[PDB]
Amino acid sequence: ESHVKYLDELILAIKDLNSGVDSKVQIKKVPSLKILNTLIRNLKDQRRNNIMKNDTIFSKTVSALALLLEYNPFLLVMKDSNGNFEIQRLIDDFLNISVLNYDNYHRIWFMRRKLGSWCKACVEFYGKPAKFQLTAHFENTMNLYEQALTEVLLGKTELLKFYDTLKGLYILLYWFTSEYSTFGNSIAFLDSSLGFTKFDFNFQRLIRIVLYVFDSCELAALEYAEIQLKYISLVVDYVCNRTISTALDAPALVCCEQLKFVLTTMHHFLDNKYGLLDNDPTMAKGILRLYSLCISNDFSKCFVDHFPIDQWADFSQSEHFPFTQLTNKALSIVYFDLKRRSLPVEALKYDNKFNIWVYQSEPDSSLKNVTSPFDDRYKQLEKLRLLVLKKFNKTERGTLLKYRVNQLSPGFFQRAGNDFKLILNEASVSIQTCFKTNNITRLTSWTVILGRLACLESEKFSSTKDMDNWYVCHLCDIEKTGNPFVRINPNRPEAAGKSEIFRILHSNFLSHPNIDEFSESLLSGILFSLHRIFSHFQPPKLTDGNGQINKSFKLVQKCFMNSNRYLRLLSTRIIPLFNISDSHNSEDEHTATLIKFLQSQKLPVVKENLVIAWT
Amino acid sequence: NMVPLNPNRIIPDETSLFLESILLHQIIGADLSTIEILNRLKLDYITEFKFKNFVIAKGAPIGKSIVSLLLRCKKTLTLDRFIDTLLEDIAVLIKEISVHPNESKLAVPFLVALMYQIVQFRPSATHNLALKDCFLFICDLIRIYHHVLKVPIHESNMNLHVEPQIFQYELIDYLIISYSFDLLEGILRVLQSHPKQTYMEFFDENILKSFEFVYKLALTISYKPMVNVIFSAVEVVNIITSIILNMDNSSDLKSLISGSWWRDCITRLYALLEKEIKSGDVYNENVDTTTLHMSKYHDFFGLIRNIGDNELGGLISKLIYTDRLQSVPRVISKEDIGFTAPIIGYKMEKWLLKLKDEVLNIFENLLMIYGDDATIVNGEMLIHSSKFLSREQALMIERYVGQDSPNLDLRCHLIEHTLTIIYRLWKDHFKQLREEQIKQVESQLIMSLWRFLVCQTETVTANEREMRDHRHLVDSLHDLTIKDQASYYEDAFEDLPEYIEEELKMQLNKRTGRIMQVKYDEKFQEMARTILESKSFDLTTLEEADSLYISMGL
Amino acid sequence: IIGADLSTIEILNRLKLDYITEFKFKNFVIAKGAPIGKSIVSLLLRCKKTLTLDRFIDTLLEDIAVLIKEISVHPNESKLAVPFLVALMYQIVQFRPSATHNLALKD
């Protein structure tokens, strides 16, 4: 359909209508409410089935419609109102389009993050009064759903209607199973934080009452199988956002009460078995999410004790556990790892077929799913497998920032891997050749690696500090208080002298014919590179007396002459870094030079980060 | 379309599941189910306790008796009754072995923990009277343990930190306090999700006053507090405020809670927000309380939250003999507890960060509890709030970006949110702010708004070219998170359907932009602009707003 | 049991066995000062959510029976376990006729 171009015309019109002035939000009403019909129609025709179920084109048209309501911010300051709340007559048909998008986790996270913006943010202009009535109507809807969830326990409902009532349950539920970054005080129960919002255990109560309702009322349709396996998916989506997001290690939990709750919940669902469904990696997905959360951390006895599946073990079979094929596969995997570090791991050796440690599996094979892979090319499935299995690496089980310096260009640890010098020389030769005109993505990842690795060659001179142990640096990256630059002591080593990273970086990213301007953001990237390399390493002179600001301080100045915050403030931070020194701050020649520099510019863009740099 | 009655339901006896989740209940790092840790404890300064058939005889493991109680009142009560009855009984036990100053009160911590596992096993039916009972109860217990919550900021000469290096009883006291503060949170939760037709009961001046004394003992502005208790107290404040909003007939109970009493909350809570975080020495006696530490000397998780390493949970895996009917328990040690994994400090700081999210959001919740207001917000919730907002702008800039650590994005999201708090205060609560305090902090206000303002045009990328380089130099943590959510942590975000990465390239990019001081959502940017360009009040001098804006334009 | 004034599970909780520091049939961790009853409660509890009615019975029968044995064939230790273990076996056995299964009873 060409209604793709119809929505294109409407979004081009709204983009044209910016505001009275060029900058386009206008928090307050401008009674000029001309796109009112199109705005209503956005959701009036969202209840259709032609291209209202498509993504790509139509999806970005809806993303542009969200930007139009932020370009009009709040027209309710003098207009846009209804009998009760108009923001709720929006949310309700948004939840209709949600039950349309009921299953697609994509289509639900995106929609409720933008409506998050709408409620947690785009009414957050005001807060109290609109929020109050919004929460009132939300609680009304919740009570209605709960009262409807009762009479289906006794059979006097429909079949599709029952499916959709329990699905609307799920939709409220997932809408509610994210972390703070998705809502705020808009909804009554997602307002607090630190392991509890007024939701979290209103929600545990929800989950346990609905387990009651499930063991009370059921039906044998595979769609119902799905709208229950999605519920175990959500009862672990409960915890995924309730994690401290530990970089790249499986994210430790904020609250071991989510841990015990979900343990109890999916273990009672091992019991329930309600609605088995074929072709379902969701089951083992949840089990391995949670075990990933429970690998070998202090949560160990927690998981094994409050979710013991082990009592479905039965080594004497090749059809091992009774839930579903690939589930029981990965669950025997998790089981078998449990047994692994239970028994003496000396009884385990790396048998090298799949190179994971294996103890004596059994005299007879009896291990059809001991280590094998199984997926319809499902990278998530096999990566669950691999992380959990190799989690007892007993070798290179560390890193996050250094692991990212390797993630972009995968296949990169095919060698020493631990070794600093391999990435040293590879990024050297990269910036020596690896660009023609467009290497402004991978070269950029090499500059973030150059910064991190400066901070690593700082982590050293203190026995094993290589890429191995690196979630973030110390002298630069453990956040502090006080005068932070107290930490940065001049007795540090000379940059170029004790960093070939500096030598060849000074050659390449600093003696660039286009360092003046090749990619503003890449400029700021190498800027933070210099920031950190200096924070760790003694400063070479900015100016050698006879001019030549050191083709890096030159970047400081020129970006200090930016047009917005970006390159400008990213420059400002490091002036002091050159100042903290000795033998170049000896006669404070550096100090006086940079004092004259902070007084060698008055351009209006830069008064702010000027006052920063001075500070 | 029948949904059939299943004429042979198997529906759990949740009191039985509770009996289980008690007898098995094990704290994080313990050798035993903490119930059994009780179950190996006889005490010789309480010969014989009873409240209602709870004889901890002269020869009883406090466990032996408590588990037996579980059995008795299991036969007696129904679920709500059993919650109430364990509350009353286990409590009056906590007293009689707490106000008895010569006996091994290490039952008490796990007894409180049992309060916790009770109230938060069935917060559905737990009810106001016993709620307040245990609330006020361990409140007076914390007034019992005045010593540890109020230990000199640095042990001024005369006072010496020559303590027996003892998380032994340090655990006893601290554990009780934090566990019971989490129990206060869970009691607030039973009422917090309880119908707001019935909110005139668990609120009373006794709740408030007990919390006065305990809150003031924990947030010890003069002595050296500990961060589990600080967390826990401020969390209690938080949920308190949550219900101060979520109570429908709000004026009456807002009259009940004294204005000076919120004021004595928020003097200490501003004190908190102005206390800071020194990771490198967070596990070391640092400066006078201006360095939230949670020192390894007093270091475990807590209950609805796990902030420390809980290393001393391992020494709870040496808390009792585990092979002996100990009268006094096995050491836990302040010295033994705590170049290894500063991820410890990082996750704990990600907490303290989320703590100050709590603090900002409940300052914000105060902002809502009054639309017409009183002494707690008198322009002071602009002074201190914007002081935090600008302190975090200055810290994120001067160090934290480039410090490029796990904290970045969480902190920047939440301090842009405290910006939004400043916004709604300065728009709706614009009524209160008077000249004296808009002059005390004209500074902070105007220039924090200016800092956020120098961004919108953003001629740098406006796209995913190398602002994704920035997403790598700082947001590398959230890059690990996009990798982890697509490869480990979403059933559907593997094999992306091509309508989502088109969005990712710019969305995660403006995420890292909000990290790196720029490209805050047009929402955010015009919030910050309209806070300042609100010429209705001469926060800016009209003849110099041009010199202001010309850093960007306008 | 008449005169055994206790929750006989607690009775069991008062049964430590130093010599045997290694025990595990269906997850039955036991050590020196580690009470038979501590592992009894261990089982009872998580076995409730794991096992069903009769499979709970059978699991108790066989596990606590392995206990019956390895203490019985352990003449060096004393067997205070087996009397009340067997008393537990009886509460099990009695609990229902129809629920209790003849296979378990056989074993």
What is the C-alpha separation between B516 and B399, in angstroms, rounded?
11
What is the C-alpha separation between A389 and B96, in angstroms, rounded?
51
For chain A, give percent helix, strand, coil, nearest 5.
55, 0, 45
Breaks in chain A, after residue numbers (C to N greater than 2.5 Å): 31, 462
Q: Does B401 touch chain C (CB under 8 A)?
A: no
Nearest by Cα to A563 from B518, B419, B467: B518
- Provide φ and ψ at A24, rounded to 5°: -130, 80
What is the C-alpha separation between A530 and A447, in angstroms, rounded?
10
Cross-strand pairs, B61: B42
Residue partners of B78: CB distance under 8 A and separation at least 6: B15
Unique residue bearing structure tokens 């039952």: B107
* Amino acid (one-letter) located at A194: L
Q: Which of residues 31-50 of A touch B (CB under 8 A)?
A: none
What is the C-alpha separation between A238 and B305, in angstroms, rounded?
15
Q: Which DSSP letter does residue A540 get? A: P
Q: Which of residues 138-157 of A touch B (CB under 8 A)?
A: 152-155, 157
Q: At what angle do helices B128-144 and B107-119 cross, to 10 degrees?
A: 150
Largest CA distance in chain C: 40
The enclosing H or E element of A16 equals helix A3-16
Residue partners of A405: CB distance under 8 A and separation at least 6: A423, A445, A448, A449, A452, A453, A467
What is the C-alpha separation between A159 and B156, in angstroms, rounded?
74
Q: Does C48 touch chain A (CB under 8 A)?
A: no
Nearest by Cα to A266 from A331, A221, A318: A331
β pairing state of A357-358 and A349-350: antiparallel
- Contact (Cβ atoms closer than 8 angstroms) between residue A370 and residue A336: yes
Please judge whether C26 and A311 are an interchain contact, meaning their C-beta atoms are less than 8 angstroms apart: yes
Largest CA distance in chain B: 84
Nearest residue, CB atoms, C51 vs list A264, A305, A311: A311
- Contact (Cβ atoms closer than 8 angstroms) between residue B153 and residue B219: no
Q: Which of residues 283-342 of B touch A (CB under 8 A)?
A: 287, 290-291, 301, 303-306, 310, 313-314, 341-342
* Amino acid (one-letter) located at B246: N
- Contact (Cβ atoms closer than 8 angstroms) between residue A357 and residue A340: yes
- Contact (Cβ atoms closer than 8 angstroms) between residue B524 and residue B452: yes
Cross-strand pairs, A253: A243
- Dihedral class, residue A118 (left if φ above 0, else alpha if ψ from -120 to 50, else beta): alpha
> At A266, is the secondary structure helix, strand, or coil?
helix
What is the C-alpha separation between B248 and B252, in angstroms, rounded?
10
Burial of A414 by CB count in 10 Å (0-12 exposed, 13-18 middle, 19+ buried)?
A: exposed
Give the chain C residue whose CA is nearest to the CA of A309: C50
CA angle B542, B546, B552 (to 5 degrees): 140
Residues on chain C touching B326 (C-beta within 8 angstroms): none
Burial of B478 by CB count in 10 Å (0-12 exposed, 13-18 middle, 19+ buried)?
A: buried
The enclosing H or E element of A525 equals helix A520-536
The first and second tokens of residue A604, run together, are 């209006």
For chain C, give percent helix, strand, coil, nearest 5.
55, 0, 45
- Contact (Cβ atoms closer than 8 angstroms) between residue C41 and residue C13: yes
Residue A524's CB is within 10 A of a number of other CB atoms, namely: 28
Residues on chain C touching B39 (C-beta within 8 angstroms): 10, 13
What is the C-alpha separation between B17 and B526, in angstroms, rounded?
53
What is the C-alpha separation between B325 and B270, in angstroms, rounded?
47
Cross-strand pairs, B41: B326
Residue partners of A35: CB distance under 8 A and separation at least 6: A10, A13, A14, A17, A68, A72
What is the C-alpha separation between A20 and A71, in angstroms, rounded?
11
Helix residue ranges, H only, B97-220: 107-119, 128-144, 146-149, 167-192, 205-218
Output C35-38 pairs: Cβ under 8 A, ≥24 positions apart.
Answer: C36/C12, C36/C67, C36/C81, C36/C85, C37/C9, C37/C10, C37/C11, C37/C12, C37/C13, C38/B32, C38/B36, C38/C13
> At B360, is the secondary structure helix, strand, or coil?
helix
SS (H, E, C) A327-340: HHHHHHHHHHHHHH
Nearest residue, CB atoms, C33 vs list B20, B39, B324: B324
Q: Does C59 touch chain A (CB under 8 A)?
A: yes
What is the C-alpha separation between A109 and A111, in angstroms, rounded?
6
Q: Which of residues 225-284 of A touch C (CB under 8 A)?
A: 264, 267-268, 271
What is the number of residues in chain C? 107
- Contact (Cβ atoms closer than 8 angstroms) between residue B143 and residue B95: no
What is the C-alpha separation between A609 and B338, in angstroms, rounded?
41
CA–CA distances in Å: residue A503 to residues A271, A428, B50, B119, B309? 64, 10, 78, 63, 41
- Could you tell me how many CB contacts below 8 A there are between chain A and chain C? 18
Burial of C106 by CB count in 10 Å (0-12 exposed, 13-18 middle, 19+ buried)?
A: exposed
Give the chain A residue whose CA is nearest to the CA of B548: A604
**Torsion angle (degrees, nearest 10) of CA B468, B473, B475, B478:** 100
CA–CA distances in Å: residue A93 to residues A40, A171, B526? 11, 13, 28
What is the structure's resolution, reported in angstroms to one decimal?
4.0
- Provide φ and ψ at B396, rounded to 5°: -55, -45
* Amino acid (one-letter) located at B105: K
CA-CA-CA-CA torsion sign (A12, A16, A17, A23):
positive
Cross-strand pairs, B223: B152
Residue partners of B93: CB distance under 8 A and separation at least 6: B49, B51, B54, B56, B62, B66, B107, B111
Kindly report the nearest CA distance between residue A237 and chain C, in angstroms: 23
Nearest by Cα to B466 from A558, A519, A529: A519
CA-CA-CA-CA torsion sign (A538, A543, A548, A554):
positive
- Provide φ and ψ at B193, rounded to 5°: -95, 0
Q: Does B480 touch chain C (CB under 8 A)?
A: no
Q: Which DSSP letter does residue A505 get? A: H
Count H helices and E strands in chain C, helices first: 5, 0
Q: Which of residues 410-469 of A touch B (CB under 8 A)?
A: 440-441, 444-445, 447-448, 451-452, 469
Nearest by Cα to A351 from A371, A334, A378, A326: A371
Please judge whether A305 and C51 are an interchain contact, meaning their C-beta atoms are less than 8 angstroms apart: no
- Contact (Cβ atoms closer than 8 angstroms) between residue A315 and residue A362: yes
- Contact (Cβ atoms closer than 8 angstroms) between residue B24 and residue C45: yes
* Amino acid (one-letter) located at A321: F
Helix residue ranges, H only, A540-601: 553-560, 566-572, 575-579, 589-598
Residue A110's CB is within 10 A of a number of other CB atoms, namely: 21
> At B161, is the secondary structure helix, strand, or coil?
coil
What is the C-alpha separation between B429 and B368, in angstroms, rounded?
9
Burial of B113 by CB count in 10 Å (0-12 exposed, 13-18 middle, 19+ buried)?
A: buried
Q: Does C44 touch chain A (CB under 8 A)?
A: no
Residues on chain B touching A375 (C-beta within 8 angstroms): none
Q: At what angle do helices B167-192 and B128-144 cross, to 10 degrees?
A: 150
What is the C-alpha separation between C39 and B142, in angstroms, rounded?
35
Kindly report the nearest CA distance between residue B71 and chain C, in angstroms: 8
Kindly report the nearest CA distance between residue C26 and chain A, in angstroms: 8
What is the C-alpha separation between B203 and B253, in angstroms, rounded?
8
β pairing state of B276-277 and B291-292: parallel
- Contact (Cβ atoms closer than 8 angstroms) between residue B318 and residue B332: yes
SS (H, E, C) B263-293: HHHHHHHHHHHCCEECHHHCCCCCCCCCEEC
Cα atoms found within 13 Å of the Cα of residue B65, Cβ hemisphere only: 25
- Provide φ and ψ at A475, rounded to 5°: -50, -25
* Spacing of C-alpha C19 from chain mean position: 18
Residue partners of A490: CB distance under 8 A and separation at least 6: A538, A580, A581, A582, A585
The enclosing H or E element of A350 equals strand A349-350
Residues on chain A touching C59 (C-beta within 8 angstroms): 311
- Contact (Cβ atoms closer than 8 angstroms) between residue A162 and residue A222: no
* Amino acid (one-letter) located at B319: L
Nearest by Cα to B28 from A264, A260, C39: A260
Cross-strand pairs, A357: A350
- Contact (Cβ atoms closer than 8 angstroms) between residue B34 and residue B110: yes
